[PDB]
Every structure is written in C-alpha cells, then in structure tokens.
Amino acid sequence: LVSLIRGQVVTTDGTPLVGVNVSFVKYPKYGYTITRQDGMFDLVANGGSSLTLHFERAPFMSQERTVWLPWNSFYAMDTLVMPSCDLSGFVRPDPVIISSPLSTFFSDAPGRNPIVPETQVLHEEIEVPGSSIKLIYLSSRTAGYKSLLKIIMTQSLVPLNLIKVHLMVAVEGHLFQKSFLASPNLAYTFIWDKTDAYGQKVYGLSDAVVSVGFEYETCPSLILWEKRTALLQGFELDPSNLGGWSLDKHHVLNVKSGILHKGNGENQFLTQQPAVITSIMGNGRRRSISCPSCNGLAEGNKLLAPVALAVGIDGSLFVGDFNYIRRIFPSRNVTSILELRNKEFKHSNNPAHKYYLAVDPVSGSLYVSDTNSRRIYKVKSLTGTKDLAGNSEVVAGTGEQCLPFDEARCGDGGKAVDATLMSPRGIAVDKYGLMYFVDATMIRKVDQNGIISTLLGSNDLTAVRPLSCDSSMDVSQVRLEWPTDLAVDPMDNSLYVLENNVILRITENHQVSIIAGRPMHCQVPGIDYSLSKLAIHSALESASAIAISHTGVLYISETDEKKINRLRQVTTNGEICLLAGAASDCDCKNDVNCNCYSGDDGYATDAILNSPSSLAVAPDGTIYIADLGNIRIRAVSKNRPILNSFNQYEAASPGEQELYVFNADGIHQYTLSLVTGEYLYNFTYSSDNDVTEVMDSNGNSLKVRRDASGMPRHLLMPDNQIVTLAVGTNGGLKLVSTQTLELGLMTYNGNSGLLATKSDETGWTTFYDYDHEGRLTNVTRPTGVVTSLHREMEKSITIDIENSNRDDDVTVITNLSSVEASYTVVQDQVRNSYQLCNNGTLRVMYANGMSISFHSEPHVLAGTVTPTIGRCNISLPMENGLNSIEWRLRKEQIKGKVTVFGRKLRVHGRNLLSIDYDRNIRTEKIYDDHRKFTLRIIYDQLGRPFLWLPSSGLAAVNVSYFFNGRLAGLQRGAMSERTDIDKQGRIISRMFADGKVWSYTYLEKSMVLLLQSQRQYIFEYDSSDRLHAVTMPSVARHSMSTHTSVGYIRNIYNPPESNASVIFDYSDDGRILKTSFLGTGRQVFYKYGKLSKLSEIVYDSTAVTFGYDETTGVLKMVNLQSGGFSCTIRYRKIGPLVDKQIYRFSEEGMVNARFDYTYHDNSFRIASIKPIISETPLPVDLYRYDEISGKVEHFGKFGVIYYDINQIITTAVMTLSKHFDTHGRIKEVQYEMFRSLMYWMTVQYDSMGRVTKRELKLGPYANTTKYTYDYDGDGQLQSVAVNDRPTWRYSYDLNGNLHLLNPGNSVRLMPLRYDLRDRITRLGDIPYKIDDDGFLCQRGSDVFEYNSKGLLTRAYNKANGWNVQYRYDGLGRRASCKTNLGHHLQYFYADLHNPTRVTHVYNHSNSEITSLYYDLQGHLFAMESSSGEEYYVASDNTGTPLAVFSINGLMIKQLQYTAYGEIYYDSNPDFQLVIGFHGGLYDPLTKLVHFTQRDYDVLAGRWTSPDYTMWKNIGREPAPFNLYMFKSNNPLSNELDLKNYVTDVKSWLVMFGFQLSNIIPGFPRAKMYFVSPPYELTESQACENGQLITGVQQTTERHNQAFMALEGQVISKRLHASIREKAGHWFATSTPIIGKGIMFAVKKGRVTTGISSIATDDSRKIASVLNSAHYLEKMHYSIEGKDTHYFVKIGSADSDLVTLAMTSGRKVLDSGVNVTVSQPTLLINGRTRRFTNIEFQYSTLLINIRYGLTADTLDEEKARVLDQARQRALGSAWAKEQQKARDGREGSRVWTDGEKQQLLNTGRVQGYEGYYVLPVEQYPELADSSSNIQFLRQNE
Ligand SMILES: *[C@@H]1O[C@H](CO)[C@@H](O[C@@H]2O[C@H](CO)[C@@H](O[C@@H]3O[C@H](CO[C@H]4O[C@H](CO)[C@@H](O)[C@H](O[C@H]5O[C@H](CO)[C@@H](O)[C@H](O)[C@@H]5O)[C@@H]4O)[C@@H](O)[C@H](O[C@H]4O[C@H](CO)[C@@H](O)[C@H](O)[C@@H]4O[C@H]4O[C@H](CO)[C@@H](O)[C@H](O)[C@@H]4O[C@H]4O[C@H](CO)[C@@H](O)[C@H](O)[C@@H]4O)[C@@H]3O)[C@H](O)[C@H]2NC(C)=O)[C@H](O)[C@H]1NC(C)=O
Ligand SMILES: *[C@@H]1O[C@H](CO)[C@@H](O[C@@H]2O[C@H](CO)[C@@H](O)[C@H](O)[C@H]2NC(C)=O)[C@H](O)[C@H]1NC(C)=O
Ligand SMILES: *[C@@H]1O[C@H](CO)[C@@H](O[C@@H]2O[C@H](CO)[C@@H](O)[C@H](O)[C@H]2NC(C)=O)[C@H](O)[C@H]1NC(C)=O
Ligand SMILES: *[C@@H]1O[C@H](CO)[C@@H](O[C@@H]2O[C@H](CO)[C@@H](O)[C@H](O)[C@H]2NC(C)=O)[C@H](O)[C@H]1NC(C)=O
C-alpha cells in the first residue's frame, strides 16, 4: 500500500537545519520537501520496496540514504548529521523488551469489585431504572492510560570495554533518542501517549521499533546496533459517546486492528487469537505440462509442483510452479509470465531441478536461479508476453559447472554474465540492489555494475576456524556445509543463510552469527538447563525454506517428508514456536493409505502440511507455504473477521450465546442469539454515526437524545422516564440522575478521562488515585478502607494488592512469551498458576494439586473468528486422576441458512446429553442417549422460552410475559401464580389458581400489601427502594437503618417499641464481620486470614479456628475451644476432594472418629466410606453409579432402580417404592419386607400443592387411617379430620401466630398468648419466656440456655429433676447430647454431600454405633447397629419416622404425631429414635426438634428463635411474614416457592434421578436442606473453589461457567421488580458523618482526610477535625445502642475549635450531625485526668476524639476504653448472676446459701470478682462482653 516517512536533519552539535531539499525519484513518481525551523522532513511513498533519498544543503556535503520501507506503516527515519576500526567477537546488545499488557481483563461484577489488578484498570458501572442496560466505565478507554515499554539493555555483568549505551524508540512517526553510560542492570521505561507524530490519536495496536547500540572504548566512532520489535496498545474505540462511558450492550469493531471493543468492558484482540490456514491456489491434482487455462482465478487453479515463492514490490506472489513461473496479482488472478524449457513432467518433485526466486526492492525485477542449468535469469516483462519461453535474460553464469579449485576463481572480478557457476541455490536482493546467491558452499555477490565477487570466500582453509556458539566472527573465518535458502532481513538489511539445519546471519559489517539451530560444536553438554524457548537452544529438524517479514520475524519451513511437515516462527526476541503444521501420525511419503491434507479453513497449528518447499511473506504479514506434497499454496493468516456477502462483519461471544453484526466500518448493527438466530438488540444511529436508539427483542427502546454535534442530553427509557446526562467541560459524564434520584456524580483528573470520584444517591463517595502512567494505585471508601496496587515492571510484571483493614495481601506475577502469558497468584506460600497459550488453551494449576486444561476449537456457526471451549482435561493428584469432558457442536443447513444447532456433551467417548435447537419449529430438544430423558423447550415469536414439555407424562411448565418482556405469570398444570403491573412497572396484584388475590397499593415511598382476610402489611421505603420500617397487621412497627461505620457497613434492625437492636456488620466486599443482639449482649465475631478465607469465629468464651495448609491452601483443621473442652475436625484432601475426616475431643469420656474415603478411577465420585469410631472399625459402604447420568445405583447394601421419576430402594429382604405425581410431588410410598407390605402412605394435594388427604397403614395387620386437611383463606392449616371426623382445630392471629390448638390427643381447645414483638408468653396455663434477643428462655419450669451463636448449650427442670447438656463442633453442628438420667450420645457427619446429615450415632451406655441410612429425598428408611441388628424405618412425606420394623419384619415401634409434630401415641417409648419430626433431632425432655441452624418447639408449633436474615430480602420480595412461624402455618406441605415451577434443564434432570455433579466435575450439586446451614459450614465447602480477586482468576471462571451451561437461553424467574443492590447495605441509609465528597482513610491506625468539589462546608469541618487523628483499632464498642469509635489527637483542640466555630456545648450542622465539645474528668485505676473531648454523632453512629499532648495519649485512651468496657462487662455479668438467683435458675458458678443470699441483697459476693475467660489482650473486641466473664475467688 502507501507509507509515510518522518526524520530529522541536524548539524555536528545537534542543531536542526532550516533549509534541506529532500528529494526522491522512483518509477514515474516524483516529489520533494523543504525543512523548516524544526528541521523535519515529511514524505509520502509506496511501501514494501526500497527507496533512496537525496538531501540538498548550501554549505554542507550533499548526502544520500537508502531505506527499506514497511508496506503500510509510519516509518521513522534515522537522524541525519551534516571506518578504520574492526570489532570482531565483541559482545552484541541483547535487550529485554517488556510491553504493558493488553487490556483483556474486565470485571464480572463491576458493582461488587471494580478493581482489575493485572492491568491496574478501574471497571465501574451505573444501573439505570427502566432498563437492564448499564453505563460502563473502563479506565483503559481513556487518554491518561498510557502504553509502557520497559527496555532492559544491560545485565548484572557489563563487557570490559563498554563505555556508552544508545537507545532509539520508533512509534507511529515519533523518534525517541537517549544516550546512557555503561552501568550494570541499565534500564529505561518508554511512555507512549497513543498519538502519531502529528498529534493525532492512534487506534488499535501499533508496532514499536526498539534499537539498542553498544559503544566500545576501542572505537568511539562505531556503535554496535540491534533492532527489536514490540507491540504497543493504542487508543480503544468509544462506541457509545456518553462522556467516556459506554452502554453495556453496545459494541464496536476496530476493522484495521481486528479488535472487538464490547460495551461491558470486554476487549477481544482477534488478531492475537490462533492463526488461520487457507488454500489460495491448487486443488491437490496435477495440471498438464502445456498449462491450458492457467490464466484465470488463483483459487482451485491446478498446479504441477510449487518449488519457489517470492513477493513482488506490487504485493503480487510469484509462484515457481516447476515448468512455468505464474504471477498471482493482488486481484487474486493468475497469469503465466515465464516458461522454463529445461523442465520435464518426470522431474516435478526432483530436488536437483529445484530453483529459487527473488525480487529486487529497487526495481521490481524477478530473479530466477536454476541449479541444473548453472545460471541466473531475470524476467523481462512481468505482465507476460506472447512468447513466454524466451521472456528471460541471463544475469550470471554461462551454463557450465566450474571445478572446486578454479584458478580464475570461476570468473570472479569480471562480468557476471561471462563468469561460471558451481550450483546456484537461494537468491536474495539487498536494499541497495546488491544481488546475493548460494553457489555450492559459498555466497557470491553481483553488484549494480554487473561485476561478480565472493562474500563468503572459500578455499582459505588456513584462516577458517570452527563455528563459535556465543561470539560473532567475520566472513573469512566461516566455512559453509550444504547451504540452500537465502533471504534479506527488511529491518536489519542483513543476509540470512539456511545451512545444514542452522540459520546464520551476515550483517552489513560482514559479521556472522547463529540465529536458529544447535550445531554439534556445543550439542551436549553445551547447555546444562536443557529446554528453553530460545531459537539458539532449539535444534532444527530437516529445514527446507526461510522467509523474513518487514517486522524482522523469521519463518522456518521444516520437512522430513514423512511425519515432520511444519512451519516455525522466530520472533525478534529470539524465541522459537510452532506457527503451522501438527505432528502427523501417518507417513506422507511411504504410507499408501494416507491423507496429509487437513486443517484448511481452521487453525494452522491443527493443520497437516505435506513437504513444504518454499515460503514468502505477504504485505499484510500472511505467510505463504509452497505445500509441494499437496500440490497447493497455503496461507497462514492472522485471525480476522471476513466481510460476508451482505458487506458485514460478524463476531461472537459463546459464553453469552450472542452473535454481533457490524457494517463495513465496524459499527454495531445487531446482536442476535448464537443459538436461536433471533434479534436481541437493534442499534440505530444519527447521520454522524452516534448511537441514538437501542431496541431490544421485546420492543423496549432506550433512546439517547442527542445534540446536533452528537452531545448526549438525556436517556429516554423504555417506560418514557428521563435519565438526565450532564457532561462536563472536560468531556466527562458528570451527572446521571432521575427527577428524584442522583444515580451517579463523577469528577475526572483534568482532560485525562481518569475517574477521580464517583458518588451515588446514598452519599457514598469512592476516591480513585492513579500514577503518572494512568494505572490505578489506590481505591478509598467512606469506611476508611483503602485498597492499594503496586507495580514492579521487570522481566516479569508483579502487581501487589493490599488492603488497610486485612492481612490478605495478594500478589500477581506475569511472564509474557512467544508461546504463552504465564500468571502466578500468590497468597503467602499458596501459589495458583494460570497459562493463557497462543493455541487457545487455558491451563490452571491450583495450589491444591488439581489442574484444569480448557481447549479451543473454531465455533461451528461463527467460524475461526471465535474460538470455543470444546474440550476440558482435568488432572487430580492420585493414581487414576485423569478426567475429560467434551462438547461436540454440529449444524444443519437448508438453502445456505442454519436450520438446526446441535450440542452433545461427552465424557470419555460416551454421549450423556444432547441440546439441539431447531430454528424452523423454535424448539430446543434436550435428550439422553438411552431414551431415559426427553425435554422440549418451546420459544415464542420474540425468541423467549415459554413452554417446558417433559417426558414420562409429567405436567408441563408454561410462563406469561408482559409487553416489556418481564415475567408475568408461571404455571405447572393446575398450579399457577400471576401478577398485574402499574404503568410504572410496579406489581399491583398477585393472583393464585385457588382464587387468592393480594393487592399492592403505592402511596409516597410506602407500599401496602393487603390480603383478602384483610391482613395488612405496610412496607416503608427509601428513594433507593430500601426499607425504613415494616408495620404488621397487629399495627406493630418494626424499624431498620443502614450506615457507613469505621471499617464496615452497619445494618440495624429494631423490634417494635424496643431498643434491643439486631445488628449485622459487613465489610466493603460483602462478607459478614459481626452479628450483634443488643437485648442481652449476644455477639458472634467473624475473622478472615491471609488467604482471604474465614480464619476465626469468636462468641462468648468460645474461639473457633480454621487452619489452612501453608502450601495447598486447603482447609486442614477446624478447632472449637471453649475453656477445657476442645473439638477438632481434621481433613486430608486429594486436590479439592476430602479423602479423610478425623474427629478429636479433649473430654475424658468422649470417643474419637475417623472416616476414610476413596474415589472411583478417572472421576470425582466417592467409591467408599470406611468408618472407625472409638478405635472400632465399621463395615465399608460401597457406592456404585451410572456413568451416563450420575445416578446412585448402589449404596451400602441397598440397590436403586429408576423408572420415569419414581424410585425403588431394594435389598434381598426389603423394597421401598416411591411414586410421584405429574408435579413431582410424592403420591404413594410402599415399604415391603419379606414380600409382605409393612407400610403404605398416599398423599393428595389441592391446586396450590397443599396436602389435603393422607392415608396411612402402619404395620401389615393394622387398619388404614385417613387424614383430611382444611386450610383458611390464607392457606394456614385450619382443621385435621381422622376418618372424616373432626379431631384437630387450629386458629391464627392477624400476625400469623397460632393462638388456638387441640394439644396432642386432647379434645380441649387451648389458647396461646403473644406480645407485640410476636414472642410467645403462654400456652394454655403454662407461661413462656422469650428473651430480648428473641430466643426461648423458659417454658414453665423448663429453663433453656442459648449461646451467642444461637445454639442450645443446656436445658433443665429443677422440679422434674432432669438436665441435658449439648456440645457443638466448629461448623455449628451438634456433636453430643448428655443427660443426668444416664443418656449420652455422640453424633457424626460422614456424608460429604450432605454435611448436616447425622450418619452415625455412638451410644455411651452400650458402646454401640448406629448407622443411619437415608433415601434419595433425604428421609430415614433404615438403620444398622454395630451389634449386628438391622432396623427398617417408615417415614412420612416430611421425613418424620412413623414406625420401626425389626430384622425379622416385625413392628417394634409406632408413632403418631399432630400436624405440628407433637407425639400423642408411642407403642414403645423405650426404643429411642434419634431422628424425629421433619428429620431433625427430637428431644423428649425439652420437646424441641434440632436442625443445625434453628430449633423447633413441637408444643407451641413454632421456632425457638427468629431468622433475622429474613429482613435482607423482604424489602425486595414483599410478602406476609412472621419471624417464628413454621412453614407459613402449613407444616405438612412443601414450602411454596417459585422453584416449584421447573424452568431450567438442571432442575428437570434432578427429578429424573440424574446427578450431573457426579459426571461433570465442578457442576453445582442440588442443595438438599430444610433449614439453611450456618455460614461457616457452607463456607468450609466453597473455600476449595478458585478465588476471584485477579482478572486471570475471573477469566478462568468464565471458562468454567460457559462449559457447564446447558440451555441456550435461561429465563429470569422473578415475580418482583429489580432493585439496585449494594454490598452489605440491607436497609435505608442514614445520613453519613463522613459526607458526600469527603475522603476518609485509616492506614495503620492513622487518619487522613481529603476534600472534593461537591463536599459541603460542614462536611469539610468534620474532615479537618478528623485529619491526623489516631484510631483505636479493635477497640470500638456498642455502648447504649451507639456504634462508638475512639480516636486521639496529639496537640491542642484550639485549631479544631476555630474550624467548628464553637467553644463548648452541642452544635447541629446542616446535615443534622451533632458536634459536642466537653472537658471531662475521668478516674481510671486510681488516676485522675482532664482533657478536651470532641464528639460527632448522627443516629446510632458516634465518633469520639480525645485531645492530649504527651506520647502516652493513645496508650491512656486505650487503657481508659478497656477499663470502661471492663466495668460494663462486670456490671452486666453480676446483674445477670443476681437475676439467676432471683428467678431460681442455676448460676454460672456454684454458690453456697450464704454466698447466694449476699448476691440477692448486695449484688456482689465478697472475695469473688469477675475475670476474662478469653484474654482481653488477644481479644479486645470482647472487653464489654458479660458472657466472657467468670466469677472466681483469689484461690483460682
Ligand atoms: C443406648 O443404649 C441403651 C442400652 O445401654 C438403650 O437402652 C435400652 O433399650 C432397649 C430397647 O428399647 C431396652 O429394652 C426394652 O426394655 C423394655 C422394658 O421391659 C422391662 O419390663 C417388663 C415388665 O413390664 C419385663 O417383662 C421386661 O423383661 C424382658 O426383658 C428382659 C431384658 O432386661 C429379659 O431378661 C426378660 O426375659 C424379658 O423378655 C423388661 O425388664 C421392653 O418392653 C422392650 O421390649 C420390647 O421392644 C423390643 C424392641 O426394642 C422387642 O424386641 C420386644 O419384643 C418388646 O416389644 C413388645 O413391647 C413393646 C412395648 O410395649 C411393643 O411396642 C411391641 O409391639 C411388643 O409388644 C408385644 O409383645 C409383648 C410381649 O413381649 C406383649 O405384651 C404385647 O401385647 C405385644 O403383643 C425392650 O426389651 C433396654 O431396657 C434399654 N436399656 C437401658 C439400660 O436403658 C438405648 O435405647 C440406646 N439409645 C439409642 C439412642 O440408641
Ligand atoms: C399456560 O397454558 C395454558 C393453556 O394450556 C393457559 O391457559 C389458558 O388461560 C386462558 C386465560 O388466560 C383461559 O381462557 C384458557 O381457557 C386457558 N386454556 C386452557 C384450556 O388451559 C395459561 O394461561 C398459561 N399459563 C401461563 C401463566 O402462562
Ligand atoms: C435500652 O434501654 C434501657 C432503658 O432505657 C437501657 O437500660 C438502662 O441503662 C442505664 C445505663 O446503662 C442504666 O442506668 C439503667 O439502670 C438501665 N435500665 C434498666 C432498668 O435496664 C439499656 O441500656 C438500653 N439498651 C440499649 C441496647 O441501648
Ligand atoms: C442530636 O442530639 C439531640 C439531643 O441529644 C437528639 O435529640 C434527642 O433525641 C431523643 C431520641 O430521639 C429524644 O428522646 C430527645 O428528646 C431529643 N432531645 C432533644 C433536645 O432534641 C438528636 O436526635 C441528635 N441528632 C441525631 C440526628 O442523632
């Protein structure tokens, strides 16, 4: 094409000349330029060919300079200044060039984590109301984000004579020059502003030319130069033009650089993807020698034998097609230009008849050199004349072969035409027009005059020295053995020789050196470290051809003709890698049944070549291969989108299942579904190509209302809502707002475009700091938390990530090479490795020992432009640990259009599942390979799934949509739930299939949910749709608030007319830190360690530690320590899988346990469990599975049969048959023993899935009992009839409290009483007591002791004389139960998939172990004793045991329960059953059923504690609720949820018994929990999963998720409006003390504040006072409900009092913040002190500052706050102890009658004092905790 030249002309000193006439003459093209004051010359010339330039000046010598021009680039010419010394064996410069990585990383959740560590990028977002389209900010899409180039020119060792080092950097016309002095480890970092020489923005990717010169003391005039190329990222295109922000769905394609810039922040550098191979000439068949119809199109045109290739100055490819020389024009047409009369059809593949081509860059002359004719020819006419046989002229040679020892030296010194040649081989023509050629074993020159000479002069055997491995010697010392190909480097102007599998370089200074290949001089032990990526250390296997690109890249052809047929690439850095040609399993030359032609229109590295003979590099950088064996010319091109028949470009995202359509200019037209082919988004533009409308598939249009210049004004949302956009004078988006909400408020750093601040409606301001390079260095939050990023750019780029509040330091190390980008994420000694290879492979090597390898293939629909993960190879650290998953993609085309898109999932060559989409009928067929499962998903005209048609006669699921595409209703047979919406899109009605209607009324931020029973719930909201208050039907108002605190976000819930606050403290990343119950003082502290995983849980006097392995990072230990008692759980793992679980106890009587696990070969499936309880080995339980479905076929002694969705559990003795209805609900259970029916149950449901009828037969001879259930207007259980006779009646409060029941078997109707907080107070005559935290305290004479974690530690009754104590493990599970009546049991959890499931019970009274066996629904069905006894359990639809049968099929126990779980009949009370009502642990003493997180009272029919986490989502999903009610007062039916409407393939598969989790490693296992497990338990399972801190970790996750995706499209199953959710913010935000626009940072306990433009004057006053203060770390407490934080200031308060404009008292600011100035006098440990005290307070948040002058000020305040907290802890502990004595309850210590009386009268006991159990020195957070205090006398 066309190139641009730019250079400077200077004098001797360095002054630019004001008058130089720069001239150039080439073909008919003429031109000249005259330099100005700057001394710069700018010229336009044709690229590729060599151009000579003349310079004219008056008092200076007129000089000429010839240069090799790049094809279509901006050439920066060397500076012009207006020979005796010889450097041989001197050290050449070997620079290490490190470029800043490409911005390929982005965030999956910019709202959760905006930090991209590796590229130091800020990825932010703004959610807008009325649309799912977001506004995205990416800090790399700015002017401030510069391109870096670290050039390490010297190492630790400097050559002795080196004095000066010179540097040159050439980027887009710019020429940077700098001189340095010789120093060890000398480096310079070049910064590019992404502009050209004219100050214009450069888009995409650019090439930099780095030149390093070495000046020696021996010769100061000459400098040893070395040229290297580097890739620099330019400006990213801005598609949306919204003040530096983009629309989430709006993309742009850079057509020139081949980059897909997605609006969501995702950048796809398409040219950096695997290279593509295509056939440009030939059809694999030979043409006739006469060449008939050889003049036409190149593609498919028959060849004979392509032996030579050369690219002309025109861009034409000259083909040495044996007999004829054919020219391929840029128009892709072929014309024969020369016929060689000495070529015969027989000698086509003969090496003796092989000739070589070369193009002269001065004049486009083509030179031919035939080895057989012993001459060199020049083609006369390159257009081809009539007589083609005589279109050549002799350049060199007469035709006769001269003898090796010629006297006249084969005509040297004279004319080339008259001279004689030995055997001419490879030819190359220099920049100056000098012709070079290989003549037998030497290199000969043919100059401009026509005189022949010898460069590498042979026969001088005396001066010849063997080839030096490291140093470079002169031409005279070099001897050549079998040289073939020759080429000139268009960047160096050096000559490259291919000689006996070694490539050598001849510089312009006649210096020879090895560039590629390993000679026998230093073969072994030449290199001790062996394998390396360098070309010098890699041996060449039968090399045949060489080619050099204009960027100095060397390509080497290697052909063995048998199996080795490949093309390798050698980059400027000296690294060698495979470019094309896979290793063929078949012999191409010997084997007759062989095809060595494949891979065309696919990836080059996968393709199989056959005998490559010649290479040539095209103007665009594509490599041409003379594939002689396949009679074709093949092209290895950069991966690029191709213009289709419609003049459009197509790119795709397989992960999002989207296809993007762009016009010829790369402007985004449409987004279609990659599966469905239906339009998802349509983009319309203005005349200036500015985006004005985004129209989705549903008809929702988001209009961008613009100005005539394209300036954005506002967004017109699909609901006709206006979102105001205010762009600043710097061009940056300043404000995003609605008529009520301020969605975003942004400031920028000058005109760089770098986001300085970003605020939301809550007033939360985040501050961003960058370095001079525009890389993110700090992120400061209003919590005072700072995230810091530090870069160290060396041979490897290291980024250090630190947080001010945590010790979780993360470091990312990046090593970029020719083959791969290598990443290492380090957390202490735990190292995770990631490798992103050029072939498209992503390899993860986890610290745990497991490795995952994702492999890319071209997409079947989108082509080579989009690689897809079609293979996944997993490796576990074990004997048979290799696993493999495969996705096989297919297509069906009718009339050139896609009809069917098929995907098949395979494991070890077997089909598991097939997901096929038929575009004609709009159906998605999901089917099994063995006729077991079939599901059809029907899509509507808008491309939305609306109907799910399953097999086995199951009820179909169908959905309704509103006009805007939002889900309107769901239906599954007779069951349906519909909604109606406002004009505002708010739900106004909710209709159920039973006729139940809920109304939703909206009145000024308040919502009123009314039921037909006239029960009313009022939800009061914020502008941000977060709850302020909830009024219950009882008219009791619950209140909530959220506020930014110091180091966390505090969420407060206040019960009605109470100050007993329930607080949930969350970190900035959304992790729980503290759970507080201010009513009694209950606290749970959560700590996170160096691996960013849970490290400690502290509550009361109990400390739970989580130990991780120093190297693997896996959870090794969980240790609970509560004084003397210790409970330790230890794990051993095979990668992330548990293979050993140990239980250890410190207690005297308690027994230990061990569980050994084995896994099935080549899987993640558990094969066996071997238990050892109390050093007594138990029998091994074997697990057998179906390899196609993951179905458990055998477990222990039980066998499982699957038919449709029904299951049969069999043994030689028993058969348990479970029958399910069309809705997947249990309809019949049939338990048979010895071919006789022992138990049968039938369940019948109403339209809504409520149990209406249950028939039960308990025993083979017992009668059948019929139970009928009736529900009230709200679906609450009203009555229960036994054989059509009313037996039970239930009634409820307006709040849903059960206030009337028939207890047990009684006819009597008993009333239940409640308080305003819904806490029970009475059950008939029996009084109940619930504490201020909401926990069960007393039931008449029964006393209950619940700890801070909400676990029952002790329960007793002094009157009835019974006492029960419980012990728990570190994961919150009940470990033991011990009574004063002899009972002592221990519980174990051996099931890895169900960690809350009690699998084994150790009984201390008989020393026997009971093994519990559960069915596929989780219900108990069998038991096995270590004594040899076997029991068979009959369980109901809720998993409640109703009957037990002996080993001989005899009913030994029969239970009858009420609807709420109270036992009224027991045939054998002495037979103790561990599992009770609803599958929990039933206690006959307490009458409670224990589930790991909550306890259930069977007498009251409610939970013993509230689930305060309900408050988190009740605002988003408003519904009738009660904190204590059991299953919405429907205890026999499965809880009603939207999950009952099966709208996803994985959920349909689960129903059919399929367990994809067992066959697809990593696939999510379906959760089988009634009660949600505690945080630490779910965390202990998920901690083995890969972290997501860095960008490479997030890239890996995208690969994992895209591989596990089943359906082509998934619906958003939500019948509620989408709410903008913040991390750790649950409720309506309280006004912050740290105002909007104020920066607040707490680094190592030191406070620093900053101010932005938007900050108010009163907010700046608080900032000024808080600056330079010292925060009392870990010493912040909840005092009288207040979130009090302590600070100290060393100096006088005078300066700060002037700022506050006050002297003393209280002042109220504009925000409402209270400022109190006082001078208190404190008495701490007998020491009196008076100081100034400034207090800042808003609602519960309180910030206190103490002023001092001494250095001990911080230490004195620490001693003051701890003593005050000690007084609070002691005051509370003694009060609680006195209350225990008053109530008649058992105290913490055993007191005598005198001690007890002293406590009752005074409040304290003489000689006794409260001491900390957990030391306050290590646990300062427990300083005010009364539950951490123990009363002891001085005897200890
Ligand atoms: C942890 O370990 C603990 C052990 O350290 C463990 O506690 C022990 O648990 C077992 C099993 O539950 C207890 O044994 C039971 O004892 C029952 C009490 O009966 C006593 O009183 C009677 C007087 O009224 C005596 O006649 C009777 O004597 C019999 O037992 C003696 C053994 O001590 C023996 O030497 C005698 O020869 C004599 O046979 C005894 O002293 C007892 O009732 C009970 O038996 C029933 O249950 C067995 C299964 O558990 C059946 O195999 C057996 O056939 C019995 O069933 C019948 O009775 C039930 C209840 O009435 C009915 O539900 C049945 O349908 C059935 O009824 C039919 O048959 C009757 C005639 O047999 C007839 O009258 C009916 O009309 C009907 O036709 C069992 O042996 C043991 O005492 C506990 N030990 C201690 C120290 O606590 C604890 O459970 C473990 N915990 C966990 C969680 O695992
Ligand atoms: C699911 O499909 C059924 C059809 O099988 C839809 O039911 C129809 O609903 C209309 C009212 O909208 C009634 O007039 C028809 O009589 C119903 N058809 C029959 C015979 O079932 C139903 O609306 C769909 N459900 C949802 C929520 O999309
Ligand atoms: C909830 O309110 C009660 C009553 O206002 C507070 O209890 C009082 O606290 C003061 C100071 O500690 C004592 O002098 C009183 O004797 C207490 N009254 C009684 C009878 O308890 C209580 O501290 C408040 N709690 C919270 C969480 O703010
Ligand atoms: C600023 O301080 C005043 C006074 O301490 C707070 O007002 C008191 O609020 C309580 C509880 O709402 C009332 O019982 C008192 O009667 C109020 N006293 C006065 C004199 O107003 C006020 O709430 C504080 N401001 C904020 C936003 O926390």
Ligand SMILES: *[C@@H]1O[C@H](CO)[C@@H](O)[C@H](O)[C@H]1NC(C)=O
């Ligand atoms: C290329 O060759 C075809 C014959 O195969 C001919 O029809 C066409 O006109 C040619 N085009 C050019 C570039 O002259």
Ligand SMILES: *[C@@H]1O[C@H](CO)[C@@H](O)[C@H](O)[C@H]1NC(C)=O
């Ligand atoms: C920002 O981070 C760097 C990390 O090298 C640190 O040196 C610096 O003190 C930080 N500054 C702020 C704003 O805390």
